[PDB]
A paper describes a structure:
We characterize the binding of IAA to MarR-family regulators from both iac and iad loci. Most characterized MarR-family regulators function as repressors by binding to an operator sequence upstream of the genes they control. When a relevant ligand binds the MarR repressor, it releases from DNA, allowing gene expression. The structures of MarRs from representatives of each auxin degradation operon type establish that each has distinct IAA-binding pockets.
MarR proteins were produced from three iad and three iac loci and their binding affinities for IAA were measured. The strongest binding to IAA was observed for the IadR MarRs from iad loci, with MarR_3CDH from Ruegeria pomeroyi having the highest affinity (KD of 0.237 ± 0.099 µM). Crystal structures for the IAA-binding IacR MarRs from P. putida, E. soli and A. baumannii and IadR MarR from B. japonicum were determined and refined to 1.5–2.8 Å resolution. As with the V. paradoxus MarR_50, the secondary IadR2 MarR from B. japonicum (MarR_Bj2) did not bind to IAA. We also provide crystal structures of MarR regulators from P. putida, E. soli, Bradyrhizobium japonicum and A. baumannii.
Author numbering:
A (entry chain A): 9 to 97, 106 to 160
B (entry chain B): 12 to 98, 104 to 160
Write the structure that this text describes.
């Protein structure tokens, strides 16, 4: 888009920053609504998810991988320790209750993901993910 | 079951579009701050550059902000000379000065976009955008 901003609706439909912003907003709103039933929010869920994958992380790494501000991540990790989902091993990990909670919330999350990908070929999903992953490599400030 | 491994997380589109949107928006706000602009004003200019007129609530959808934030920023943009109120409700239109400002500051965002798409082929950009646009159609609550 060297010569100028996207100018028509058809051009906007090809402008990836608009698309990932509109998507992230609606996905996160819907997810936060569903998570409210469990008394947690997106940041807590994303923290459970990345601790499930990595087992232990520092609070700084949680902030990066769960995509939240460092100050918000430290306060939320303390909240999650108080509520028995995370333990302090500055590295933290899941408690059994934290893993159980992730497991119990995943059916609804999987249903939301199924709706997200309706009408999209698996090969196109793979190309889209490869593109977005390289974009993350291009602009991330933290190399994790 | 949730993404369980690092490789799975690296291919998980909701993680990717959240991490991307966060860093892109933070960078954009930082780079625009020197020009007295924020994310919402810039994205409002950007979508009125396409549509010319929109209601405030439509601006909130397409510029991806809260309705209340959009209303306050639109009023600021009236004082900035960048939009004008029109006569169904809360209609605003881009002024020639608003168009000129967007064209003037665009090279900053074009630079950021060039960084974003480094190492990504045009055909893969096209596939990525088509996937994300269908995802928007699948989950959007507003039919704009």
């Amino acid at each position: 888009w060297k010569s100028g901003p996207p100018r028509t609706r058809d051009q906007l439909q090809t402008y990836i920053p608009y698309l990932f912003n509109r998507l992230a907003n609606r996905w996160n709103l819907d997810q936060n609504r569903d998570l409210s039933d469990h008394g947690i929010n997106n940041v807590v869920f994303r923290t459970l998810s990345v601790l499930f994958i990595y087992k232990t992380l520092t609070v700084n790494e949680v902030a990066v991988l769960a995509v939240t501000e460092q100050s918000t991540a430290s306060r939320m990790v303390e909240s999650m320790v108080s509520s028995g989902l995370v333990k302090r091993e500055r590295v933290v990990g899941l408690t059994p209750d934290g893993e159980a909670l992730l497991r119990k919330i995943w059916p609804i999350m999987a249903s939301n993901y199924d709706k997200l990908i309706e009408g999209i070929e698996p090969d196109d999903i793979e190309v889209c993910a490869r593109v977005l992953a390289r974009m993350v490599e291009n602009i991330r400030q933290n190399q994790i």
